[PDB]
Design a protein around this ligand. Structure first.
Ligand SMILES: CC(=O)N[C@@H]1[C@@H](O)[C@H](O[C@@H]2O[C@H](CO)[C@@H](O[C@@H]3O[C@H](CO)[C@@H](O)[C@H](O)[C@H]3NC(C)=O)[C@H](O)[C@H]2NC(C)=O)[C@@H](CO)O[C@H]1O
Ligand SMILES: CC(=O)N[C@@H]1[C@@H](O)[C@H](O[C@@H]2O[C@H](CO)[C@@H](O[C@@H]3O[C@H](CO)[C@@H](O)[C@H](O)[C@H]3NC(C)=O)[C@H](O)[C@H]2NC(C)=O)[C@@H](CO)O[C@H]1O
Ligand code: MG
Ligand code: MG
Ligand code: ZN
Ligand code: ZN
Lengths: 403, 403
């Protein structure tokens, strides 16, 4: 294949989600949906009476569901969060101002999302394609927690005053806004809960969101495919416009990202209504795009496979990454996987390479790494592979406490 | 050793928890604490201004923290939950009446509990003895979800009308109250989120909870040790009194329970205050009990080890149970454990034996088992070990859909 495309839809489930799902199904592909459950509560200020129907249809159809937080951080856009807050923030347009504030509260929003999903669909955990507790994406933010060495933030994603399309707006990646700094902490809290987070390469959207009637300004299928072609293997998160969609320190050429393109779009752009004629104009674009992307030799996949699943009978080179039971592992030596050689916290063939900061078993630590353990922070003084008896609090050779 | 004692403390963290912890530490034992985070919000109606101090002290001292739900189900004791609800329910004493109503909301209370703990102590996931997301116990309820074949419920734990001690109160284990039925669904929901739950063998309690000043009438250290000796290998959950603390269908002689006694008590019974002189009278009892228990050849352990942890080097017999990363596994073949042979979803040496009902990989299913998959129920038609290709919806020779 020329490469792998990951279609990711954000900010559902809403009414328009239903027809998007039908189009994917007709096109013979699976996508990943990053949902905000407040639409199930009827308070997300969209046409969303069919929210639960959409949720069920996505899972019944085999699409992957991931976590985009409960309320899309709207609680940071208003003084007091309530049933009208979505409408209030829509009135002001202040979604990317002060978007992140208290990182502990903001991270908790991702757990609340799961509570609400499991309330409206009590059987949701009986679906393997429900990945709401493993896969996440932060509102507004092109940020990544993929492996121990594949992590990077969207350093201009959100603002402390002006919107990115407003005159006089300035971002200094070397000195991120307060909101961005909080978003980085959220990333880290989620990673320690076992989440991976992923951003995107290309966004099927208007030029920017200051743009009026945005649903009417989506790129056509063929030029969008051209844009995808340009993204492939060109470190798109660093070159993408506008500036608040950038991931500045994205690890260019990192092997896990080779021959892949992650597409962001939004369910609500496929609705005929207050944003334009989305369903009439954009659903056929999505249909056509899938078609011509396959002809060009692309295949489509989901974010639960972005990091490839460990597979018996596959030959791995040393340093290759696999995903196993929601945890990332890195091959210690080149070898062919056997049934009883699976990655684990004691495997000789793999080390845990999750993007977390809490001290963890079977991790190859490097000098300078900082770990959290029993409420304290330790510097790795001597590079080593962690094991159960070498805990930071009692191994003075390996770890030095800060500070 | 004669046997293993598991001291389990319910309903903390409160002020009284602090000196309890000091006594455990002085006695050189570790214990398991089943906490309700509403005390950290200051609304649990106890002396709890030192709640956070207590939480931190328990974790710094190596004790295990388990999940007892956010509010101890007090939301089902009042018409509308708020800051006064603990006090309101303490005024009526209706805790065991309608204690469980909507199992989905009641289970969510356990998740809310973790949000609150991780809010007041943001570094709490850095403690390995934090087991809030793995180990639980239901308020009021001697209920168990340990393995696929070790599961049982407290069939008279809570009522649909009167207090258990009241005249007129009737309990029929063959026709459990609605509150009990709801609590059973709570167990199943928690199990499907990967929780184990455990009840207790003996309860260090007042003579009777029906009458005032319960802290004063706690059994002395020596006679309590005799209660423990008597409970050893005697299936105490079936013989325990009163009827409301019983686990009627507890699996007598089940292998994981051999030579073990789980003790229940409550932190608040060790406080000088509204329940009596608990600190003055009962702390010494606990100090003595630990001393003489050890002297009699008992060891003390924590609930994270109740199901023994898989350990490299140890030799296992076919049929033996281990715990590995919060998941219960059962040995397929007798062997000595090696580094590369951790139990998992692909191991040929172990099968998954978690107490869950959702279809799960690498489970040894038997004819008659019932599983949930993608929102539907299936009956196992022929015995087999589950694997990725053999999903219920595609294997009608192995599974039969239930209408
Ligand atoms: C300069 C520029 O355009 N930057 C783009 C970012 O704005 C954009 O983030 C997305 O922004 C839009 C608009 O602010 C978000 O849409 C809002 O979503 C909320 C919740 O669904 C909804 O209540 C609002 O109505 C809706 N606003 C409008 C005007 O329709 C959208 O969710 C943001 N994206 C993510 C992943 O959270 C990013 C990504 O498109 O692109 C930048 O170029
Ligand atoms: C008929 C009989 O003896 N039943 C016993 C049960 O009462 C007892 O379960 C525990 O009961 C106590 C007393 O109600 C519960 O205490 C309450 O706990 C809440 C929340 O922490 C607190 O707000 C109330 O003030 C407090 N009541 C009092 C009088 O102090 C306690 O939570 C129950 N236990 C558990 C694990 O949830 C059981 C076990 O001791 O024995 C029964 O026989
Ligand atoms: Mg993970
Ligand atoms: Mg578990
Ligand atoms: Zn979004
Ligand atoms: Zn309790």
């Amino acid at each position: 294949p020329k490469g792998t495309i990951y279609l990711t839809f954000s900010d559902g489930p809403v009414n328009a989600s239903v027809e998007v799902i039908k189009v994917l199904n007709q096109g013979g592909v699976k996508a990943t949906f990053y949902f905000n459950a407040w639409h199930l509560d009827g308070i997300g200020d969209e046409n969303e009476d069919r929210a639960l129907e959409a949720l069920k249809l996505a899972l019944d159809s085999g699409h992957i569901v991931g976590n985009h937080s409960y309320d899309h951080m709207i609680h940071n856009c208003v003084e007091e969060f309530g049933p009208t807050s979505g409408a209030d923030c829509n009135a002001t347009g202040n979604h990317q101002i002060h978007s992140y504030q208290d990182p502990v509260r903001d991270a908790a929003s991702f757990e609340q999302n799961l509570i609400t999903l499991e309330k409206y669909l009590p059987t949701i955990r009986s679906y393997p394609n429900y990945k709401g507790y493993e896969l996440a994406r932060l509102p507004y933010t092109n940020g990544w927690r993929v492996t121990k060495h594949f992590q990077a933030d969207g350093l201009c994603a959100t603002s402390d005053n002006l919107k990115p399309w407003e005159p006089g707006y300035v971002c200094d990646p070397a000195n991120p806004s307060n909101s961005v700094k909080a978003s980085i902490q959220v990333q880290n809290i989620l990673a320690n809960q076992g989440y991976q987070t992923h951003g995107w390469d290309v966004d099927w959207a208007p030029e920017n969101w200051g743009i009026p009637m945005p649903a009417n300004s989506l790129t056509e299928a063929v030029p969008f495919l051209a844009y995808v072609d340009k993204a492939l293997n060109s470190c798109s998160p660093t070159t993408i416009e506008p500036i608040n969609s950038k991931t500045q320190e994205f690890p260019c050429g990192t092997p896990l990202h080779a021959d892949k393109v992650i597409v962001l779009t939004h369910d609500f752009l496929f609705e005929d209504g207050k944003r334009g004629m989305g369903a009439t104009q954009n659903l056929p674009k999505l249909a056509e795009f899938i078609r011509i992307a396959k002809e060009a030799g692309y295949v489509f996949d989901t974010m639960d496979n972005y990091t490839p699943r460990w597979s018996v009978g596959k030959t791995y080179q040393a340093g290759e990454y696999v995903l196993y039971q929601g945890v990332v592992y890195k091959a210690v030596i080149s070898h062919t996987a056997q049934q009883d050689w699976a990655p684990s916290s004691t495997s000789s063939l793999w080390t845990n390479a999750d993007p977390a900061t809490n001290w963890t078993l079977n991790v190859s630590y490097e000098q300078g790494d900082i770990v959290n353990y029993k409420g304290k922070r330790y510097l790795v003084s001597v590079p080593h592979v962690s094991q159960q008896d070498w805990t930071p609090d009692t191994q003075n050779t390996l770890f030095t406490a800060l500070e």
